[model samples]
Target: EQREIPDVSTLTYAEAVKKLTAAGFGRFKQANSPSTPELVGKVIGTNPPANQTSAITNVVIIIVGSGPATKDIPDVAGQTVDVAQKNLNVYGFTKFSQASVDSPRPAGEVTGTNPPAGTTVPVDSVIELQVSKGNQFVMPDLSGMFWVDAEPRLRALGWTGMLDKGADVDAGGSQHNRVVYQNPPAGTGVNRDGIITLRFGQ
Candidate 1:
């Protein structure tokens, strides 16, 4: 029986698959073509063209659009990896990674992402996750390190560094406004996002 290939050029990949299967194509393949963001994952065209047909059990090739979308990174933290993956799937994050870090949550639960929560990135961007290994980082030596240079570096490393003028770490010193002391000291392992005070103006 010759069945017209139902037009699916404007349908998304999932929708195209459903329509093709119902039309009696036993086997199907989807190939991508460059397309606008709106057309991404939509069917581009079909091989048999509508009306001209072949065996219902024969293979049908589907052309799809490969355009990308920009999306807000989902907050997958605290969820299991399998659950997190499913959330990411909807947003087109085809690539991702998870590494264990020191965390308060149970093992296998996501702690956070490299970009943190709620940043807009490409739909297919590669991303990292902090799972749970222990959630600590050695307090790097900031003593005598210049305040202007050291503070920014620490923040970039994900540590909260506070300056104090009353404590020895920041109080009266030979050189004013330089790192004099740091709580937790260098080499002390502190939890992620841990706060440290650096006395300046010594």
Candidate 2:
């Protein structure tokens, strides 16, 4: 049977695919042409040409506009999401996306990027910024508190993991026996399962 190829030149790639498939074309191939900003992702033309008659099983080559030949993705790690967006735009990236994940980095900071740094892809390719949502817990200030006093507070704060306790041999005799040191000092990011080491003055 014969079918007329739909005029998909004015449609986007997804819309073009839909029109061609409905026109009985079973296989399709994509061809990219250098793009003007407005033409990006839009269909250029099709092989066998639009409005021509062809077999339903014959492959249709759909041409679309892709911006630039390629552009290198930049290293945006540790930057705030706003900074990451600005840097990506310097390379002509127009598609900005983001998602949150647990990270040691502060909240709203970009942990890394999708496709990672140094990957060369089309300028219009989607760039995903992996933003940090901050850690599950932050180590608290326990200086000068007795081990017994700090232990209960730590447990109440949802620290169910290992708590290693030891004596501080470097402490002077003037101060009362209390917490003198701690591993993963105050304000450090940690998970619930992370370890905490406390040293009490001997």
Candidate 3:
């Protein structure tokens, strides 16, 4: 007598193998097909197909998803952003993004990438460079701006400094939430380790 092949489309490769083995299949093999990034390495289906019957003596081929051919993500750490871009482009990784990271490295120096160096990924994957912009950027003019709008800009500017709310100024309505005063003022060099106080109107 033969047993039915249960559906394994939703299961992982390991689970599918275990299920088939538990069901008394004497042999197992993998059939790979190109799949999207998300489906790579996951089970696609089983051969003899789901719900079909075959003797336990037959091989159960588990069809699994495989990614498109991949290439090694180039190692560009410690290189300047310009050099890093050149290196990645040589690998056909043209999609790019930059993140300001806190490091002792000089400004525009590459700290690392998102998937990091030496990772294997599809050649078309977007790569984000972690560029270090050490703590000395110029302070932005945040006067007359609401705290909400100013906060993100500060972070983008790579400010690692402390923020202290100063004594409120005299005002009314939405104006009360605006930064009426900022210590150290604008047009000055930022000290990432120092405190930056913003005074809002009352």
Candidate 4:
């Protein structure tokens, strides 16, 4: 006569093994070693490997496993923009945009990152970057004209002005005359938004 098997749904591995042992169901033995018994409560063959099955005996139960998640932050400073982007790509990061700044470093060199180095963020996180464009130019000369003339000339040359009272010496003997002296004299390469002070002469 055949004996009935107990339900394994609620039984832990140890419990299942104990119940099976008490029921006199000897553990299965592999052909390679008759003395060694197969692991208890471990997976055997399934009733339906590909399709779902209701048969409890046909179900095989193995230990659930998990893997460790790991991440590393890469140093990208001093690298060219293209190279830095490539390095980030290799590390699974995307979304490349740039903000430019003036520095001696070559253009597109990575000046800094948003999160900064040593930050162990998740994989594929967006890493913002600042790039260096080298030192900016000095403001240009904007002297030798009345407000009317100076304003137009500065505007035409892409310059913004901050007007102030002119010195008697700068007035050059005229009551309301032209710009006579200017800081960041003519021919100086000035960056955008640079300021220049002008003195008018009479």
**TM-scores for candidates 1 onward, in order:** 0.35, 0.42, 0.39, 0.36
Instruction: Summarize candidate 2's per-residue lDDT along 1-202 as a digit string, tens digits.
Output: 8998889986898889898888778788999888776778888889989898898888999999875668889899999998889888888998988999877677899988898999998887898889997654668999888767887887776677897887665687754677788888898777767889888777
Work out candidate 2's RMSD over C-alphas: 11.3
Candidate 3 structure quality by residue, lDDT tens digits, 1-202: 5999888885788898888877777688989987777778888888899889999888888988997767888889889999999988888888899999766567889989999888888888889999987766667888779878888898777777888998898877766789888877787776676688998988
**Candidate 4 residues 132-186, lDDT tens each?**
8754444445555677876666665555545545464534365356667776667
Give model 1's clash tally: 12
Residue 43 CA error for candidate 2 (Å)?
18
Worst 10 residues of 4 by lDDT: 28-37
Candidate 1 lDDT, 1-202, residue by residue in tens:
6577888888877788788778877678878787677887788788786556677777778888877657788899888878887888887887888787776466688889877769987776887877865456567887667867987777765555454444544355555667776777787766656667666664
Question: For candidate 2, which ten residues in a row score worst on lDDT?
Answer: 167-176
Q: Which stretches of candidate 4 lie over 4 Å from their true place?
A: 1-70, 136-202
Top candidate when judged by TM-score against the true structure: 2
Query: Alpha carbon lDDT of residue 51, candidate 4?
Result: 34
Better of 3 and 4 by TM-score: 3
Roughly what TM-score does model 2 have, to 2 decimal places? 0.42
C-alpha-based local distance difference test score of model 2: 0.83
Better of 1 and 4 by TM-score: 4
Model 4 residue 125 CA deviation (Å) reads 1.1
After superposition, the stretches of candidate 2 with alpha carbons farther than 4 Å from their true spots are 1-68, 136-189, 192-202
